[PDB]
Write a protein that holds these residues in place. Structure first.
Motif: not given
Ligand code: FMN
Ligand code: SF4
Ligand code: SF4
Ligand code: SF4
Ligand code: FES
Ligand code: FES
Lengths: 87, 41, 212, 428, 263
Positions: D176-178, D194-196, D349-359, D394-401
């Protein structure tokens, strides 16, 4: 990656013979200047203190890291070798 | 008409349809760009 | 499940795998699908093709893909672990999937999952001893409207019920891979209760056209 | 200019959204496509962006941003690189089926609109990234592209026009992240999805380090007939700031779940009642509705009777519109279970590169499971609210939102049910 | 000229374009916290700890990666950025394992000192942690990956400086595991530098394993004699012995890196 332990000129002494204590193996000394450290906001202060107290000194100049041009866009180039294969 | 379903051809697709069609399409497609380089190494 | 590899007798770097002469034609077409540089872009289609020629992805395949593309193998391992459509362990002939996100959990998906469990005698993630069927619980698949659905080897069976997956399975066991789509009165996303959006003919060309 | 949601079939810009006439060329040509495309292209690129800016066309994907402005970010000439156009079809958000239902049953709209978008912008070609689970749909699309190439509408002379174009079909692999602008780009480039960080923006450096503007299916599929019929006509429907038609996917706890093209700013109740006939048990049996797919918070039925299906209205209601995939609950289903399932999804469906959505997404998943079972206490609700607010910006992409917003929608409108389940578990 | 006037907590500073916020603040003296950016490696904004508000913009920005624009005030000690740092530390230390007395980077951990300055003092985490399979690289680098923070400061070194490309990330979510997908000896002449790169003690050295601790150690700035490069070096002692070697920073030689022999 921190750099606050820098920023202050220090003044250490030459090291001397330590030896194994024959009872327990502790590290012994015969000099009292072993654990000696002073701190100075600048360099001329340190040269002054040493010349004043009669110590021959060797001054190691200030080592500052080169500024560098970072770019997060170079990692995704069309032509350059900065195109990293990962992310 | 508007009486039934007429996306019927997909009921008989194999595994290698998409790739066979990309193959047949590579003929039509134009030359591609070039970064003056074979890889980022 | 694991995201680490340990060399089994079955899966190993000398497990045999090389593309057929036609898959190489497909591969060079895929590489023509992208510029001369950045030929590494074909990792996804080429790995999917290997998976499509062998069913699953042994380490031998993941390294032969790198050899073909002259990409390092570690990047291929990254790519194969990330995306879920790749089977890094061997599966059956019919890889079954069941959506359990809320738009399909909320239309009795657990019923289908239970019926698909008991009819096969397996648990959720297991494969059958005949290596014919498997089963997994996955996320959305883009047919949330036809909510109770599955995916069986790149085809969809939708808007279904327990009887209309028992029938499906018993049709798969005798070889008759049946017709995909809604196993109901529908044939597409339209409302089951008759047409409500459009029923008149669509207009011809030159309609409503601005000057120019 | 008041209480307008209903319309007729002259305006149905997706005339074959039900696969009832034909999806191939011979049958689509009758439905008004590939008609005057040479005149459209040779009219000019800036004329197309003017039509867009006058149409008030906002991005019909998740994040609705006005096109024209977005497409005008690479009107400038090329400083030694080609330009590209990525059409997004990783329709992975729950509830969203419209892009599938157009991908099949009307691919030629997409193809010609993509061409039009490229020539409005500048583009050597296009890359139609499509979900990996959409095999048969992608094959219908490849067949349509092949028919177009054969008939001479794309390639060395794209409908003439003195302009050469190609159209590629990249195939995803189930993530889904793609669907994000940049994870999509890196997946096309041949890496993880992995988003930029944004910057850099895709219009200065995008796919293969080249300029791009990513766009959704319908966002481009409605472009050519917009050019063919004007921005006045497209902007006449809908409120002044968010205009036009809109595909509407409906799911869950309604008698006739369906996909519909409708007039933007239609009320949610008009939409549910006219098409996809009344919810199970009727309006009184309604409990809550999610207007977007899953990256939008809940609605409590207090503002379902007095709310228009728009960006601005749902924003005023502390909510938001995305791809407009209506989902309905009807008092006969545990709601915290549903939102816990959505967060289980956003964890998978998280990618995991940025800590907030990872944990923190895993935090919220575990805590909401514990709330389902009732094995928590209400002092953790505001803690989890704080966790959401930590994850938001606090995220790179808006999946944390998108993970944090359903949580807030449940805490804002359904807190006493959590309280009740907690006291029940505590008593027992 | 090609300069830019930028403000940092009001105080003005002149920097070139192509710079960032971290460098602008470094020109003042402030270093922004960080777990992913190194100043010798490719940028990857994966920790999200370098977050600062700008005086009127609605959200925060990655100070390691965001280039700085004309007419900006960088607010480092504002409540927004402090809230961000506290949250990021919460998330980092959520699944981190209570192995601080074991861990050889114990009084050398950036995670510790950053939790101590730029972080809260309490866990509101009441769930079970994870635990990751460990990897047997080789006789030098001792991988304990139950504590990796997924910063990718190691894959970038191995790809850009050692030129190896045998290190990556497998999976996604919390279940993403850094390292190889296979058993492979990451055996290069620049491999012990990851021990200095990894701020966390996810990977340490095996010879130094469990021997000393950083406060015990006296540090004498010496040089190398293995090769004729003249790599500047710090020799760390403990009660008259030699415990480990470390690099010094000199940009003309030993650019924070040393060979595996001399360490
Ligand atoms: C996690 C995530 C997933 C997304 N998935 C999609 C998607 O599947 N399809 C889509 O059109 N947009 C998706 N988006 C929004 C895209 O950024 C957007 O579609 C793209 O920028 C095009 O916008 P447009 O509507 O102006 O064309 C997603 C965003 C995020 C953060
Ligand atoms: S929010 Fe999640 S999916 Fe998006 S970049 Fe961060 S970890 Fe990846
Ligand atoms: S890296 Fe080691 S010292 Fe630092 S927090 Fe983790 S266990 Fe403690
Ligand atoms: S092993 Fe260390 S350097 Fe590598 S990603 Fe993990 S924390 Fe970062
Ligand atoms: S939520 Fe089940 S198919 Fe989309
Ligand atoms: S230091 Fe910027 S995100 Fe890591």
């Amino acid at each position: 990656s921190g750099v606050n332990n820098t920023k202050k000129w220090k003044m250490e002494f030459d090291t001397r013979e330590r030896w194994e204590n024959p009872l327990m193996g502790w590290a012994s000394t015969a000099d009292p200047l072993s654990n000696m450290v002073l701190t100075f906001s600048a360099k001329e202060d340190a040269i002054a203190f040493a010349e004043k107290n009669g110590w021959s000194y060797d001054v190691e100049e200030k080592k500052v890291p080169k500024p560098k041009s970072k770019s997060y866009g170079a990692n995704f180039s069309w032509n350059k070798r900065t195109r990293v294969s990962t992310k | 008409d508007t009486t039934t379903y007429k996306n019927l051809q997909h009921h008989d697709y194999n595994t290698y349809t998409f790739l066979d069609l990309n193959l047949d399409l590579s003929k039509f497609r134009l030359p591609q760009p070039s970064s003056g380089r074979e890889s980022p190494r | 499940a694991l995201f680490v590899h340990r060399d089994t007798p079955e899966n190993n770097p000398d497990t045999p795998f090389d593309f057929t002469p036609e898959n190489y034609k497909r591969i060079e077409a895929i590489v023509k699908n992208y510029p001369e540089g950045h030929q590494a872009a074909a990792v996804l289609p080429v790995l999917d093709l290997a998976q499509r020629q062998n069913g699953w992805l042994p380490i031998s395949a993941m390294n032969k893909v790198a050899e073909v593309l002259q990409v390092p193998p570690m990047r291929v391992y990254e790519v194969a672990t990330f995306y879920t459509m790749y089977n890094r362990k061997p599966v059956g002939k019919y890889h079954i999937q069941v959506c359990t996100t809320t738009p399909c959990m909320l239309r009795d998906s657990d019923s289908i999952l239970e019926t698909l469990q008991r009819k096969l005698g397996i648990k959720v993630g297991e494969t059958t001893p005949d290596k014919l069927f498997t089963l997994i619980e996955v996320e959305c698949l883009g047919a949330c409207v036809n909510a109770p659905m599955v995916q069986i080897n790149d085809n969809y069976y939708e808007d279904l019920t327990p009887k209309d997956i028992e029938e499906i399975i018993d049709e798969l066991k005798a070889g008759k891979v049946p017709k995909p789509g809604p196993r109901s009165g529908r044939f597409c996303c339209e409302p089951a209760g008759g047409l409500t959006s459009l029923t008149e003919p669509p207009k011809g060309p030159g309609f409503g056209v601005q000057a120019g | 200019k008041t209480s307008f949601g209903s319309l007729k079939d002259e305006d149905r810009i997706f005339t074959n959204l039900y696969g009832r006439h034909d999806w191939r060329l011979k049958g689509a040509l009758r439905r008004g496509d590939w008609y005057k495309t040479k005149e459209i292209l040779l009219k000019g690129p800036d004329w197309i962006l003017g039509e867009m800016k006058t149409s008030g066309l906002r991005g019909r994907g998740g994040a609705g941003f006005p096109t024209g402005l977005k497409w005008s970010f690479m009107n400038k000439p090329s400083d030694g690189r080609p330009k590209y156009l990525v059409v997004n079809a990783d329709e992975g958000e729950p509830g969203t089926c419209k892009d599938r239902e157009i991908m099949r049953h009307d691919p030629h709209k997409l193809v010609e609109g993509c061409l039009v978008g490229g020539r409005a912008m500048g583009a050597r070609a296009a890359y139609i990234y499509i979900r990996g689970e959409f095999y048969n749909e992608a094959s219908n699309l490849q067949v349509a592209i092949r028919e177009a190439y054969e008939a001479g509408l794309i390639g060395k002379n794209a409908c003439g026009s003195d302009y050469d174009f190609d159209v590629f079909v990249v195939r995803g692999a189930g993530a889904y992240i793609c669907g994000e602008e940049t994870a999509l780009i890196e997946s096309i480039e041949g890496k993880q999805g992995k988003p930029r960080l944004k910057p850099p923006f895709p219009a200065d450096v995008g796919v293969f380090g080249c300029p791009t503007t990513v766009a959704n299916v319908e966002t481009v599929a409605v472009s050519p007939t917009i050019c063919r019929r004007g921005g006045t006509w497209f902007a006449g429907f809908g409120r002044e700031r968010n205009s036009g038609t809109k595909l509407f996917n409906i799911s869950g706890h309604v008698n006739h779940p369906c996909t519909v093209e409708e007039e933007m700013s239609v009320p949610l109740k008009e939409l549910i009642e006219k098409h996809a006939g009344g919810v199970t048990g009727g309006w009184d049996n309604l409990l809550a509705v999610i207007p977007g797919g899953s990256s939008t918070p809940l609605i409590p039925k207090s503002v379902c009777e007095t709310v228009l299906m728009d960006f601005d209205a749902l924003v005023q209601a502390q909510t938001g519109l995305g791809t407009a995939a209506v989902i309905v609950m009807d008092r006969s289903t545990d709601i915290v279970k549903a939102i816990a399932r959505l967060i289980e999804f956003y964890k998978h469906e998280s990618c995991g590169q940025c800590t907030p959505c990872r944990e923190g997404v895993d935090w919220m998943n575990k805590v909401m499971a514990r709330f389902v079972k009732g094995d928590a206490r209400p002092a953790e609700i505001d803690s989890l609210w704080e966790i959401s607010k930590q994850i938001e910006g606090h995220t790179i992409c808006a999946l944390g939102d998108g993970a944090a917003w359903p949580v807030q929608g449940l805490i804002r409108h359904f807190r006493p049910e959590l309280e009740d389940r907690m006291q029940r578990f505590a008593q027992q | 000229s090609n300069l830019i006037e930028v403000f940092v907590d009001g105080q003005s500073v002149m920097v070139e374009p192509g710079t960032t916020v971290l460098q602008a603040c470094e020109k003042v003296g402030m270093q922004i916290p960080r777990f992913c950016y190194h100043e010798r490696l490719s940028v990857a904004g994966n920790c999200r700890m370098c977050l600062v508000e700008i005086e009127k913009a609605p959200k925060v920005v990655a100070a390691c990666a965001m280039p700085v624009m004309k007419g900006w005030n960088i607010l480092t000690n504002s409540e927004k950025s402090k809230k961000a740092r506290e949250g990021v530390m919460e998330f980092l230390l959520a699944n981190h394992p209570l192995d601080c007395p074991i861990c050889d980077q114990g009084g050398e951990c950036d995670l510790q000192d950053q939790s101590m300055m730029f972080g809260s003092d309490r866990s509101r985490f009441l769930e079970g942690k994870r635990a990751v399979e460990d990897k047997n690289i080789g006789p030098l680098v001792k991988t304990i990956m139950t504590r990796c923070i997924q910063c990718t400061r190691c894959i970038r070194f191995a790809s850009e400086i050692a030129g190896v490309d045998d290190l990556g990330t497998t999976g996604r979510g919390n279940d993403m595991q850094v390292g190889t997908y296979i058993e492979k000896m990451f055996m290069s002449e620049l491999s012990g530098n990851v021990i200095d790169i990894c701020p966390v003690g996810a990977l340490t050295s095996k010879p130094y394993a469990f021997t000393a601790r950083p406060w015990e150690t006296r540090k004498t700035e010496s040089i190398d004699v293995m090769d004729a490069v003249g790599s500047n070096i710090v020799v760390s002692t403990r009660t008259g012995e030699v415990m480990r070697i470390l690099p010094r920073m000199h940009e003309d030689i030993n650019e924070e890196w040393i060979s595996d022999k001399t360490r």
